[PDB]
């Protein structure tokens, strides 16, 4: 239910759209 | 599409 809005990061948070 | 590594959300 989440879609990345930017590259995912190792051991760190990143931005997602929900749904 | 993934499902709930570390996530903030806009």
């Amino acid at each position, epitope marked *: 239910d989440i*879609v*990345p*809005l*930017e*590259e*995912e*990061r*190792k*051991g760190n948070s990143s*931005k997602y*759209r929900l749904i | *599409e*993934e*499902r709930k590594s570390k996530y903030r959300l*806009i």
Partner: antibody
Amino acid sequence: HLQLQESGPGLVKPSETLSLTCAVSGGSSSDYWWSWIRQPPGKGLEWIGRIDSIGNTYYNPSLRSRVTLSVDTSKNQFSLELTSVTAADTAVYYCARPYCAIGRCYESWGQGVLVTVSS
Amino acid sequence: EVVFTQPHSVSGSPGQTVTISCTRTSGSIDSEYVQWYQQRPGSAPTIVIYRDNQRPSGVPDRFSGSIDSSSNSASLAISGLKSEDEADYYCQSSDDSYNWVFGGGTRLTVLG
């Protein structure tokens, strides 16, 4: 496994601006992000930059001042402009975009377009 | 700047395990994911390993990835070497600004 298709002028004169676009087929053009990479003939991969859905851009520090990336998802257009090209910019330019199935994502690249800088 | 160095050339005869290392010159290897790309003649690079040690479904299970904090390096391991494994391999990771950086590439030759 995305079908990414790069297109551009083939030949660019030295000092002019190299312009490329990329479109995606077989997936959605929304969300995620878009990257450019190049490979001069007979050499290694060199990253150029990335633009993501938040609007943020990232550029190779050694090309920063010459590179502009943009994306229009309604047109299905991922764009690169590289200014003041020289012979060193002759390369295959690849578009890359994550291929995403339920629960899994990893980068998929187009087959590249060769751009030659020559008079 | 941050650099990822690779051996210029790795080779093995069929059946061997070969490894290709990817040494980060500055900052911690563990700080950002490491990807491995394979390139065959006339085609674009394809992921064989991502996020340090994940493998796409169509990539043989003979391929695997690892991270070694003490040498600050990542390794791609190819077990039971086969002729079709012959190719160029590049590692790819990121620096502290989230810029991609590619290693310089390794030619893998399958002997005999």
